[PDB]
Amino acid sequence: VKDVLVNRLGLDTRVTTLGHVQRGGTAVAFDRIYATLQGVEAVNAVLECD
Amino acid sequence: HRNLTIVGLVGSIDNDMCGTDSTIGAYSSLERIIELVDYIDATAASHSRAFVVEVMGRHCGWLGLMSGIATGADYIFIPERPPSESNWKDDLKKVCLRHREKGRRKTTVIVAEGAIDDQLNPITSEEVKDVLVEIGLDTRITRLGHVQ
Amino acid sequence: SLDRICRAIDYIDATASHSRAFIVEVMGRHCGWLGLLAGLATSADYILI
Numbered sequence: 001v002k003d004v005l006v007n008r009l010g011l012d013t014r015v016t017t018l019g020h021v022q023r024g025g026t027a028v029a030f031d032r033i034y035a036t037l038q039g040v041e042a043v044n045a046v047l048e049c050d
Numbered sequence: 051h052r053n054l055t056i057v058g059l060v061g062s063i064d065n066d067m068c069g070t071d072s073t074i075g076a077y078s079s080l081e082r083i084i085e086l087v088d089y090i091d092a093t094a095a096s097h098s099r100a101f102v103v104e105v106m107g108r109h110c111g112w113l114g115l116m117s118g119i120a121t122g123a124d125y126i127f128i129p130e131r132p133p134s135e136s137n138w139k140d141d142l143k144k145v146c147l148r149h150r151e152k153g154r155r156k157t158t159v160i161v162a163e164g165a166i167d168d169q170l171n172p173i174t175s176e177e178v179k180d181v182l183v184e185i186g187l188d189t190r191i192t193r194l195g196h197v198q
Numbered sequence: 199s200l201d202r203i204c205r206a207i208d209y210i211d212a213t214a215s216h217s218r219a220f221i222v223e224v225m226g227r228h229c230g231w232l233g234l235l236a237g238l239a240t241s242a243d244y245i246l247i
Contacts, residue, residue, distance in 0.1 A: 001221055001246065002221060005219040005221075006219075009219070010217050011217050011218060011219035012217050012218055012219070013218075013219040013220065013221060014218075014219075014220055014221070015220075015221040015223060016206055016210060016220065016221065016222050016223065017223040018202055018203060018206060018222075018223065018224065018225055019225065021202050021206075022199045022202045022203065022224070022225040022226075023199070023225070024202075025202065028201050
């Protein structure tokens, strides 16, 4: 992708790679609220199971 | 207009300029690096993991150094004190495994934009990743890029 | 994860300049949801999903 931008177009291309950044940090409000409720449901589901 | 009146301000993330202890943008750029490495660090540690951070700054090892201190990096690559072309890989291995022996599970290496060996050959983060991978560590490159 | 990506793109957009292109290499092996949503949230020119 970089070479196409640098050679087919005249653009000085700078790559940014997130790597482990994309798995680290605290869960966003949506993930905290939803993961929590899912945990609660998973327990009930497991108990209600037949 | 016979006598030019010219004043200079150092607007540089590098922190390369002489005579000034710090240039405009240097600490902010350092903050962006820290911002990212903080995410990497903010996970519960895994048994055989490694992380490589490709940091910007073409002419000076200040960002690399300061990131090293600020993040508790195992090893850093700076143009001012480059390792031997002959045994940098073997010294990298030593340092890392020493810390891993002492309890460290979050092996972090910082590679500057201008990173080189004592024979002027550049040191890519991919080169560094390969070294740590052959030590049995699942290595992940993080290139800051224009974020800095 | 989508948030981490957008945090980087936001920092990239927060600057000046001609002859400049920027590549955001995104983690996500099977799906293109992260690429598509980051692309949408940050109005990216082209996405490879």
